Amino acid sequence: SQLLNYIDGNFVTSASSFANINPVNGKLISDVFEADAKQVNEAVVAAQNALKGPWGKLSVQDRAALIHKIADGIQARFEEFVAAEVADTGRPVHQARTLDIPRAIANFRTFADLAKTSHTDLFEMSTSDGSGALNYTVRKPLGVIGVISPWNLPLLLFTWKVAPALACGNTVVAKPSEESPSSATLLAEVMHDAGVPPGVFNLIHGFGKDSAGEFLTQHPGISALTFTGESKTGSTIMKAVADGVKEVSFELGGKNAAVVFADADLDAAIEGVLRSSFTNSGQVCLCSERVYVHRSIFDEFVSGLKVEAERLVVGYPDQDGVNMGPLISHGHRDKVLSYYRLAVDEGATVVTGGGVPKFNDERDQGAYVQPTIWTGLSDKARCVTEEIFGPVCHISPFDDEDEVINRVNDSNYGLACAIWTTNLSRAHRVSRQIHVGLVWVNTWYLRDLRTPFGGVKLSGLGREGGRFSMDFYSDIANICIKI
Amino acid sequence: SQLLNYIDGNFVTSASSFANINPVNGKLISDVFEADAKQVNEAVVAAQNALKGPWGKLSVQDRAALIHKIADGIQARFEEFVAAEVADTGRPVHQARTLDIPRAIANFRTFADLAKTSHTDLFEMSTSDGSGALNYTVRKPLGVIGVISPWNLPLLLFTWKVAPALACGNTVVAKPSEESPSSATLLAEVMHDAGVPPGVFNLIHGFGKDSAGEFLTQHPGISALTFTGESKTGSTIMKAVADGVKEVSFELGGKNAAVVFADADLDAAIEGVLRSSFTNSGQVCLCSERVYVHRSIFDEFVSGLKVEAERLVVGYPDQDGVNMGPLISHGHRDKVLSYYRLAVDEGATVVTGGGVPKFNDERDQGAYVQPTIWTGLSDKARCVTEEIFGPVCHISPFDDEDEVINRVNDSNYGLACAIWTTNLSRAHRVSRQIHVGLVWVNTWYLRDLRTPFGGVKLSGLGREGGRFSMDFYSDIANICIKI
Amino acid sequence: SQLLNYIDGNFVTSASSFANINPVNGKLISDVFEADAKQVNEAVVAAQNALKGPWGKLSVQDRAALIHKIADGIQARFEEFVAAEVADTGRPVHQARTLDIPRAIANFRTFADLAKTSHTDLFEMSTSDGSGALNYTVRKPLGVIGVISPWNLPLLLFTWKVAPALACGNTVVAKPSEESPSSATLLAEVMHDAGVPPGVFNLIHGFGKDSAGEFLTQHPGISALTFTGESKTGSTIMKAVADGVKEVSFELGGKNAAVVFADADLDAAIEGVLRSSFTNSGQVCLCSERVYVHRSIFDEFVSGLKVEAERLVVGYPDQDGVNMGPLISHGHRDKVLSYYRLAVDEGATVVTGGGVPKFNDERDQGAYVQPTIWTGLSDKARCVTEEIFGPVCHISPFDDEDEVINRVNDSNYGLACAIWTTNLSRAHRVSRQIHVGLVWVNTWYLRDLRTPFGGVKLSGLGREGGRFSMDFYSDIANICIKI
Amino acid sequence: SQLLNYIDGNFVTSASSFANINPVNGKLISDVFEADAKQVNEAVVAAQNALKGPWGKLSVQDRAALIHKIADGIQARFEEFVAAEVADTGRPVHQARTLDIPRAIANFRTFADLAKTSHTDLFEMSTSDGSGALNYTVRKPLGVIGVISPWNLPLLLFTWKVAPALACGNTVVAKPSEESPSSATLLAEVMHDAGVPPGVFNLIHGFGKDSAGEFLTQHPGISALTFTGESKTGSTIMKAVADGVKEVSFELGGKNAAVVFADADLDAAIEGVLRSSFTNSGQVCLCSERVYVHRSIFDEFVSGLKVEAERLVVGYPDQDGVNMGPLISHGHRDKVLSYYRLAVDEGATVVTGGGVPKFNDERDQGAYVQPTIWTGLSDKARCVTEEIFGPVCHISPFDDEDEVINRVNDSNYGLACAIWTTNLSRAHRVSRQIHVGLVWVNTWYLRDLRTPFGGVKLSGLGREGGRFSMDFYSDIANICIKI
Ligand SMILES: NC(=O)c1ccc[n+]([C@@H]2O[C@H](COP(=O)([O-])OP(=O)(O)OC[C@H]3O[C@@H](n4cnc5c(N)ncnc54)[C@H](O)[C@@H]3O)[C@@H](O)[C@H]2O)c1
Ligand SMILES: NC(=O)c1ccc[n+]([C@@H]2O[C@H](COP(=O)([O-])OP(=O)(O)OC[C@H]3O[C@@H](n4cnc5c(N)ncnc54)[C@H](O)[C@@H]3O)[C@@H](O)[C@H]2O)c1
Ligand SMILES: O=C/C=C/C=C(/O)C(=O)O
Ligand SMILES: O=C/C=C/C=C(/O)C(=O)O
Ligand code: NA
Ligand code: NA
Ligand code: NA
Ligand code: NA
């Protein structure tokens, strides 16, 4: 199969392509045309031009309706979206069916709804002459939005940036991850078939450095760049846009902690930490790679977790009760296994996992690894401070509330934390002292799309979610009328 | 006179120093101790540690009452602050008495109040098990805020940053412009005498490149950098913080237009452009350096403005009916005089001014220039497109509304615009189509401190003012409780 | 046997019926079953109980979706709703097609959406013991809402109350006007077919006093009473609910003015006042019955308006260029004719109309009156102070701005006013001085469902629209957690 | 001591005077001049004219400063206000100094602040012709506000209404309770000395029926009636204003419950219920008169409470560690002892209290009763269902969460509830199911002035607190400009 760019209402190829690899089994799924500078430029210019076309004349109610028509379009090809996401990533079918695609549909519908009910402010004031004045605010499109996205929840995160950009009347030039270009390509078809005017949504394929990613980022025609990926890539991109002083919104790594206090419901914590460490084969920015458990229940916790971890079915996306699929790619398994080793050297006890499973079939040419649990490491070990982004956690005991708060916060990252406790005072007292953007108490990755959703310190810049997306993807302008 | 740094509750000197010059007569006002990389380091460390002391334990109410006392202490020393801003900048006394110092006072009071009345959000949601969940947001300090401010409205822009930073419970390290250090140092004294705990507010004197400015900007202990200055300086600072992925807030240059339509109140428009072009001797980012006037009134508008500009009194800050002081320094005057020549070279008719007035007294050693009006340059001329930041405007005719709108918007800046018309529809039809952060109709620089206040494109990054300042100087964190 | 009640999920008849008459020709359209005290009680109890059934358990997202299915179900029977509205009221078919039915559908949609996007508040505080507390608010259904609506925009006004009621999770007992019951009956069939659970929406037919209206108003089981109708009926209802201290929300009469200044677009103003005085045969609470025109344009305005008014086509709802239908009933027609005479006794010049047109066909048995224009009455004439609710305006000259503002405000009502001027200052300076809930400048009855939409003084009690409807139809509860 | 009315800038006496009696010892404190209908009229008319005078021309920020001046005036006479509250009511001096007087000051300050920070809304919309329109809202004074307040928290509740009234630019005619007129009279003095324009604040003394209160309530010149007091008086007043359709805001009775679960911190819960039942001698609308305790800890709870209640000191307001003063009056004490007898007749075990203490001094001429606990009554008993408004609670066991929720909600009132539990889920699951305006978990009457603060069912009509007071005390008007 072939994946083409979508520029100014046209599918187009390039002077080059790269392969897209299925990671269940190393096989080739598709050729993907790499967008070059000229093609990027042609994309930005057409998104510029589309702002002064029929898109820009739509009322907010008619724009909202079209976006709902985009969402209806995805629902109408639902099983194709599932297949494309799975194929690219190895994600279990069931989870692409209940989380990834439905969420993408809800991203468009939610931001269309926000854009319809959103309004601005009126300020009255007195003047020397006694006649007064009015200041009012108006909401406009920011302009052309560059969107660069990652591979771990391809459609979910691509639509999280694209839906609010379009809802706010912007136009978009979007560059999905090289590793998962398929669901995005299908979206371009949904856009086209829905009647989205040419130039409004442009899809470019490519890599980062020296490819479409970077050219987008350096193009003076964009007004903003929203990005999700590695912290180091954020810093790079921040440098690249600096001369145009472009608006930037970044969601970046974390090294997230879960915390289990003595008075937690132990079973629920074990189950919750299981999900939080090994969901999507631990390839979510939100996953817990450090776990702190109070000393009085530490051994029981580690035993319980070891057991549930070994019951995880690691297999075919469509295999009966499968829980995990592979990593995204071999290159990413190379990094993960490299942490697995570094853990050993640094002194870790391997409670479970620690290498790759053996299938005796095509999956052995894929990119699977095992759910791993470590113990024994100190707070300064590299395997406890750096993001691995695999199905791994380290577990460590603690004694004191103040102590464990300090240990959770002793990080250059700040995305999420989960806390397990049945106590009312503790939950609210400890939550507010954790230096992260998202705390969950007795659950994990529960989602309400109205909330601010982002991290502090190296884990982000700005916030998105709810009115914070409405603010980022819009230009607020103040008009003052002297009376 | 000597101006010391203020670090961790103590006024301190440095190993080096530089001169503060009175632009009215070129004389020495004070010596100012440059802070080195090392002292910048102490100020930051102390500001970090101040977060974990008494300041960090005050209620929102007590924090606000202490900020009201800062304001009372400026008020108690009102005339000394007036004298300080005048000496540094040459500004007319009446302007410092009515705009500059009362605004620095109201900036503290406004943000104190905003901090008392501000709340966050509560979201309720259903969950699969029927028990529901709550997500609530809380408002924390961002951390250490680095503040770097310009020389044109020194205490006003300085406090516009420091007030919300402190009201949101941050600690601060602030670097005022080398050209206008006095009011900031007096402010450090007020802070001290009001009992602001040590480390909350730190004042570091110095320059930018390879100095205090640069150092603050590179220190990893800061959580954010807020800045007002040149667009290119913004670009540099954005590169400098990119490795730490620090929150950034920028208010940068402009090349602002005023538009005078045929049905304008002409005499009121002439007066308004006079004020918008020549206030503070054109040294305000808000000033109008491009002016568009409908062809049927262009010649009469030009003649009227000439007359009014030639009546302006250019002189001592406390001279009788003084309207305009000098430029900030000889170096800035060199830059302005250079653009004055450039305009003649690009074909300008000099309608008035275009040189330096001759006093035959001490002021001739100062940094004065004449108010200047040009005519006859094309929209491509550099003088019509680059920020001069002097008492100058160019005046060009137009015939058509859509035409003028495109000429205003054809610029890389987007700070402000003023429009003059008596027509209800036009006011609101035209205003919304200007691609700037601030439009005024039939006035200029009329302020309501609740509004968003900043520009688009090269004129800004983020927004401040009202709840935009509270959003930027706070960390908004989400807490999700599964019920 | 044609129009039934709908109580607890079944259509039911009653012990007595009353005639519904077509105002186009005085013919019987239907027999309507009048609910008695016992049936009103059965409806309140069933609504009470449905709050504890499945309706009570739906999530906000699912409730909203169900409300969108109510909307979809109206859309699917679009032409039957049109035919129903037209049959009861004689409204022109094109108007029912473009205003009445689409707005009823959008009422349901807009409020479903607001229910989904609305959130509440979170307040942090300090406490003496240094642990702090949180206060947060939650929105809950008020309970059973009793809805009593009028005959002039039947489905539009009925759903304007029913949609936010249901959107906030209440249940409803709703009594449409005796003169226009058909569209509400069809609405119940839509509710039924959409699977709205039994008891959630209940329809009772009848009159006011000694009938279903009054009984609903006195029943101790309702939590609120929302009403649209005459002021005097509002007072009676406020007394009836007083022992129960029920929440109330009333939208009552007005005696609205239009004001035309010398600088208006005169042709637009004549067209504007034509719509504002004669739309729906002047049977809209928002219609202009008093017009003030500046003396320099008075004769011209009056002459232009005469011509336009005598070009209005008064006739059959499906007749070719029809503009006006009949009045709602012979009873309402006699009230209006009684005012037409009083106008002549009080000294009015009849510029046009003043009686009933002669059709020489079955329309002569209907309830038509002519569009009428008066001149020469005094500001204290009863015809200029009491609401007529017919297709009638009096036009009076004025001279000064202060004077006409005082005459507009000299009224016990305060619903709406329209102002015609092209001057920017005047628009904003006058509009703000008019003591009404709604001012339109250079237009009339322009509608944005997000806005507060009601009147002051005798014209209203409380306020609906936007977040104001969400406030009224919700119970807001504050929960305080000591930490 | 004499207490005059304050009408139109002047203190004035009346044709008749009544006695204010000190409830500690039955001695005469003052004569109070009852206002008659003519004087009420005089007040309302002055208040109307005051809206067109200097008060009406104040900027918001000036109005606010002046309200801060009122608060400073009270702060300057702090101990005189303390002595005046104490003498009228017998409340402990420490309660007056820590709650009553400071809250009255903070009411004025909080609302002044809110008046300065508050803005309104801007709605942009499309129109047929593609030019669009704008809807903006403005905030105006409502008009004259009639205020009627009770005797239990005289100055706190009086100023809780007067303050937001004045902050929103209304004028006021206010009638304190005949039982507690002194602090309000001193408030009139403060207003006058603060330069509050004549007619802006008017004070009238008297009773309800056939006196100042009724007459206020029936005057056509008021725009609204805010009222705190018994539910029955609520109804009477809602009737009286019905002919005028005046805005109304009522805070009314309750029969509040406290619920102690098995996992409560029992000693904290005992202290909390002791404070919630016996503060101000149970004469707060917020007090718990019904308490439910889990069966497993019921006996231990009652024992513990008995001991603590028997250690309460009942006596003079300045007596050492006094906890309770007398009831407000001999009449109120007759009502309370009536309910003490009824309880015995209905079968209650008197756990402690149940009579009047014996003092052997002037306190035996006062209106003291003992703190009283009952056990053994059924949910239907009158003493468990009707509001007593003295220092009494009944305690009953329970077994199941859903059961105790139903028992609390089984009431015609819905003011407040307090819940004691250490369990996180329980606090939030149970809180949200209680049908009241205000729930406290692990505390009672902890207050943040930003919150909504009122009850549901018979306990209330409308809501005040934070922006709910700004909504009630303002006229929000919508202006729509066709562009
Ligand atoms: N919301 C969040 O906080 C969040 C969520 C999920 C994943 N992540 C991150 O996702 C990452 C997975 O992807 P990765 O390791 O390949 O990240 P990456 O930063 O290398 O690249 C992700 C995206 O950035 C593009 N890119 C890379 N270099 C670029 C450059 N110089 N200029 C422009 N674009 C460039 C890539 O093509 C891709 O589309 C993880 O490292 C993790 O930190 C963050
Ligand atoms: N938004 C507004 O402000 C607005 C809008 C449209 C119409 N109106 C009013 O609509 C009115 C239509 O005339 P109308 O005779 O229908 O007004 P009405 O007040 O007599 O009747 C309106 C509704 O109230 C019910 N009703 C009448 N008396 C009652 C009683 N004692 N108890 C309970 N319910 C009672 C009626 O049966 C009907 O459903 C006009 O007179 C006009 O004032 C107001
Ligand atoms: O953003 C990073 C992980 C996100 C999960 C989401 O559901 C989301 O971003 O919308
Ligand atoms: O910020 C640039 C000019 C600012 C003037 C102001 O009044 C302000 O920033 O507050
Ligand atoms: Na792949
Ligand atoms: Na200087
Ligand atoms: Na009819
Ligand atoms: Na008394």
Chain B nearest-CA distance from C132, in A, is 10
- Resolution of the experimental model, in Å, one decimal: 2.2
Distance CA B4, CA C374 (A): 81
| Chain A residues closer than 8 Å to D137 by CB | 122
CA end-to-end span of chain D: 64
Distance CA A39, CA A18 (A): 16
Q: Are A20 and A32 in contact (CB under 8 A)?
A: yes
CA of B17 to the centre of ligand 6 (A): 14
Residue C230 assigned ligand-binding role: yes
Token output for D301? 């709870």
- Partner residues linked to B6 by β-bridges: B11, B203
Tell the residue number behind the tokens 């149940």, with chain if given: D354
Token output for B394? 């160019």
> How many C-beta atoms surround the C-beta of residue A232 within 10 A?
13
Q: How far apart, in Å, are the Cα atoms of B227 and each of B43, B187, B213? A: 18, 19, 10
Sign of torsion, CA B440 B442 B444 B447?
A: negative
Which DSSP string do the residues of C22-73 spell out, in sequence order? ETTTTEEEEEEEE--HHHHHHHHHHHHHHTTSGGGG--HHHHHHHHHHHHHH
The verdict on the CB of residue A447 being under 6 Å from ligand 3 is yes
Which DSSP string do the residues of B407-443 spell out, in sequence order? HHH-SS--SEEEEE--BHHHHHHHHTTS-SSEEEESS
Distance CA C74, CA A34 (A): 49
Ligand number nearest CA of C205 is 2
CA of A465 to the centre of ligand 4 (A): 29
User: For chain B, how many residues are written?
Assistant: 483
Answer whether B134 sits within 8 Å of D450, measured CB to CB.
no
Angle at D278 between CA D275 and CA D282, to 5 degrees: 125
DSSP H/E element including C270: helix C266-278
What is the set of active-site residues of B? 251
Closest CA to C401 of C255, C250, C292: C292
Instruction: Find, in chain D, the residue whose alpha carbon is nearest to that of C481.
Output: D441
Name the burial class of residue D52, with classes exposed (0-12), middle (13-18) and buried (19+) by CB atoms within 10 angstroms of its CB.
Answer: exposed
User: For chain D, how many residues are written?
Assistant: 483
| Chain D residues closer than 8 Å to C476 by CB | 437, 452, 463, 468
CA of B369 to the centre of ligand 6 (A): 16
Comparing CB atoms, the residue among A239, A427, A431 nearest residue B239 is A239
Q: How far apart, in Å, are the Cα atoms of A23 and each of A87, A331, A390, B130, C414? A: 8, 11, 14, 37, 70
Closest CA to A119 of D137, C418, B473: D137
Instruction: Find, in chain D, the residue whose alpha carbon is nearest to that of C450.
Output: D123
Closest CA to A109 of B122, C116, C167, C102: C116
Distance CA D266, CA D243 (A): 53
Answer whether B428 sits within 8 Å of D481, measured CB to CB.
yes
Distance CA B176, CA B155 (A): 9
The strand pair at D2-3 and B10-12 is best described as: unpaired
Quote the strand ranges of D381-432, DSSP E. Answer: 392-398, 416-420
Distance CA D214, CA A323 (A): 73
Look up residue C188 and give its amino acid: A
Q: Are C202 and C6 in contact (CB under 8 A)?
A: yes
CATH number for the domain formed by residue range(s) A1-253+449-483? 3.40.605.10
Token output for D92? 């402990």
CATH number for the domain formed by residue range(s) B254-448? 3.40.309.10
Look up residue D340 and give its amino acid: Y
DSSP H/E element including B128: none
Mutate to test the pocket of ligand 2, among C88, C152, C219, C233 (most ligand atoms within 8 A of CB): C233
Query: Could you tell me the residue ranges of all domains in chain D?
Result: 1-253+449-483, 254-448
Comparing CB atoms, the residue among A140, A245, A480 nearest residue B439 is A480
CA of C292 to the centre of ligand 2 (A): 28
Distance CA C466, CA A12 (A): 46
CATH topology match: B1-253+449-483 vs B254-448: no
Distance CA B405, CA D473 (A): 43
What is the set of active-site residues of C? 251
List CB contacts of C317: < 8 A, sequence separation 6 or more. C24, C86, C90, C91, C92, C93, C96, C325
Q: Are C231 and D245 in contact (CB under 8 A)?
A: yes
Q: Are B212 and B206 in contact (CB under 8 A)?
A: yes
3-state secondary structure D191-208: HHHCCCCCCCEEECECCC
List CB contacts of A90: < 8 A, sequence separation 6 or more. A22, A23, A24, A281, A317, A325, A326, A327, A328, A366, A367
Answer whether D427 sits within 8 Å of A424, measured CB to CB.
yes
Distance CA A219, CA C369 (A): 68
Q: How far apart, in Å, are the Cα atoms of C104 and each of C115, C251, D292? A: 17, 18, 48
Q: Which residues of B234-256 are buried (b: 16+ CB within 10 A; e: fewer)?
A: bbbbbbbbbbbbbbbbbbbbbbb
Closest CA to A317 of A11, A23, A104: A23
Distance CA D447, CA C126 (A): 10
List CB contacts of C224: < 8 A, sequence separation 6 or more. C142, C143, C144, C145, C146, C246, C247, C248, C249, C472, C473
Q: Which residues of A86-103 are buried (b: 16+ CB within 10 A; e: fewer)?
A: bbbbbbbbebbbebbbbb
**Ligand 4 atom nearest B453 alpha carbon:** 9
Distance CA C18, CA C176 (A): 14
Token output for A79? 């099983």
- Partner residues linked to B225 by β-bridges: B146, B248
